[PDB]
Amino acid sequence: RVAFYAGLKNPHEGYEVLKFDDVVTNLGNNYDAASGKFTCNIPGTYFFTYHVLMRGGDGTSMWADLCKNGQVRASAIAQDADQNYDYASNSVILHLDAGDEVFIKLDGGKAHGGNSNKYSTFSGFIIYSD
Amino acid sequence: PRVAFYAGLKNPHEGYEVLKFDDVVTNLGNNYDAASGKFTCNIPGTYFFTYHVLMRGGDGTSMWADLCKNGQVRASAIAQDADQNYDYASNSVILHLDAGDEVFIKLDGGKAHGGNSNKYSTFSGFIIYSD
Amino acid sequence: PRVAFYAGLKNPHEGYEVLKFDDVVTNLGNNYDAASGKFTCNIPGTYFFTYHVLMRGGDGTSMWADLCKNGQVRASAIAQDADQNYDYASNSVILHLDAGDEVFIKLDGGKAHGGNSNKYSTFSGFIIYSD
Questions:
Q1: Which of C73, C75, C81 sits opposite B122 (nearest CB)?
Q2: Which of A99, B61, C10, C77 falls 20 to 30 Å from C113 in CA-CA distance?
Q3: Which of B2, B83, B88 sits opposite C90 (nearest CB)?
Q4: Residue A121 and residue B93: Cβ atoms within 8 Å?
Q5: CA distance linking residue B99 with residue B59, whole number of Å
Q6: What CATH number should be reported for the domain holding residue A38?
Q7: Which residue of A has its CA nearest to B97?
Q8: Per the structure, how many domains does chain B have?
Q9: What sequence ranges are listed for the domain C1q (chains B, C)?
């Protein structure tokens, strides 16, 4: 039983890993709010999905990619020339070995983080155990 | 247990209200009710939910749609476009639910698209684990 | 049973056609066919599908992408931006499938992005229940 869901509490920007630290669900305790990383304990096939809200007001574009051990497994862009809010979102199904890390990383731009409203999110669960 | 649903919004809505997804495609367990717009948990456990609400085009610039558990925000989303283009308010959650708990999408400002059968605006969910 | 797939689009496409996601990451059950872009049901049951299709930026203002079961639309989505910005057509369904049923994403007008490694445009699904 492994499943998690968390929101961004704070704004982040640039090329950093997103620390989703408004934790709603964390069965198995394999997601780490301090780092923003899911670290596999139970090897198997996993679903992950993410929804990152681009900060409105300036910068035009924002990129957010889902990485496995630092390697891109899905990418997303949010873009609006009038500086409107928009979302960078995607979903994956991956294999994870014990120790494998999964996280969302910015690749330019500004994401909003809201102190309780869970606009920007990250979730995942195990589909099959190896 | 077999508990899963998928429904589209058949009519436009623009109020501060629960979105009644009434184009029901799937409803194993029949825990989703098109009349209220709500999924009511009857088997405690862990559930996945996702929603995709299309903002009405050519008529306004912002729309908000939130997923609630009982009446409480568990995810929020915004669609925004200064040129009144179509755009989506979309998000996904994983929640633990108790018997009698309700999960649903509330429109929280702005105008949403609903239509007869194309299922542009949607709501789905399924149980991952039984507790 | 194990039935689960995730694939990305390697290759630009446009118009009115089945999107053939060809960067196949996961394909347990071997029921997704990159050559046709179709998932063909082997094990009758209840299935989750989701898709995210990136509209090409800098060239066009609207793009439609629909999830179909056999001939039939079961979810629709639109990307639209008057300034030709990148934006996504994305939606999710839960469907019952009989053996032989085909599920795929169809472009319904407009231009989609595909590229080699980044997987901006994606299609995934998995069985939730066996009949």
A1: C75
A2: B61
A3: B88
A4: yes
A5: 40
A6: 2.60.120.40
A7: A25
A8: 1
A9: 1-131
